[PDB]
Amino acid sequence: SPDGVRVAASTGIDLLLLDDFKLVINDLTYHVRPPKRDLLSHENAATLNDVKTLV
């Protein structure tokens, strides 16, 4: 993840590609910046995220 947190071995790619993320090879930290493609109002994204769990 953009900070010390590392992603799992199960997170779906799109769930990852949502934002930047450092990819580490054997001895280097390649710093990926994927193209911003969320395309949804964050608040609206939130109020939907609220729904999904609430269901």
Partner: protein, 53 residues
């Protein structure tokens, strides 16, 4: 929430826009057809005359 989500995303408009696209695309399919429609309806009429003969 979903209703607030509904109105806040102009979905009703998008719904129309969805269909409005389809009906338009169908018109295109009809448009390509009109030229080649008349040519077969002869070859139908022609191959019909030779058959009713």
């Amino acid at each position: 929430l979903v209703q607030q989500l509904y109105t806040t995303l102009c979905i009703e408009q998008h719904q129309l826009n969805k269909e409005r696209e389809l009906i338009e695309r169908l018109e295109d399919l009809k448009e390509q057809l009109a030229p080649l429609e008349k040519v077969r309806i002869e070859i139908s009429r022609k191959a019909e005359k030779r058959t009713t003969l």
